[PDB]
Design a protein. Structure first.
Length: 132
């Protein structure tokens, strides 16, 4: 699974750092998402972070709408270019209504301030049904 995501800042630009339980899940996620993106004719800025992490870089609007931006309310927002890439990525990340504003035919999600308030804020996913 995706174990954790982070709002980071890099060269004064918002990123989403995505962490994976392992290097193999990271690599596969990288190849699958990139492929789905290019099939949809999108250049989605997902790049290598580390052994077990990737980054979604900032959007370059209006030229390249794909990537992270700060919305006028100060939320981290991620434009996925097309509704189909959103549909593809979100479940694999585990991102849901409790995490973000996600809209029917929209291509952009908005993280709740009470969930990711600012730079270096973290959301950790822990597997459901696990001993507690
Ligand atoms: N900096 C940006 N990066 C990516 N998309 C943006 C940016 N600014 C505006 N948009 C898009 O324009 C849309 C206008 O409506 P929304 O605020 O719902 O969502 C917005 C994003 O999809």
């Amino acid at each position: 699974m995706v174990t954790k995501i982070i709002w980071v800042s890099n060269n004064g630009k918002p990123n989403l750092k995505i962490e994976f339980v392992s290097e193999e899940e990271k690599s596969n996620f990288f190849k699958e998402v990139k492929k789905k993106a290019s099939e949809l004719g999108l250049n989605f800025p997902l790049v290598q972070g580390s052994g077990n992490s990737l980054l979604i870089e900032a959007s370059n609007y209006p030229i390249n709408p794909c990537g992270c931006y700060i919305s006028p309310g100060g939320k981290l927002a991620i434009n996925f270019g097309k509704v189909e890439l959103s549909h593809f990525i979100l479940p694999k990340v585990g991102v849901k209504t409790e995490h973000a504003e996600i809209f029917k035919d929209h291509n952009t999600i908005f993280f709740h301030k009470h969930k990711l308030p600012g730079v270096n804020s973290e959301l950790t996913f822990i597997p459901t049904g696990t001993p507690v």
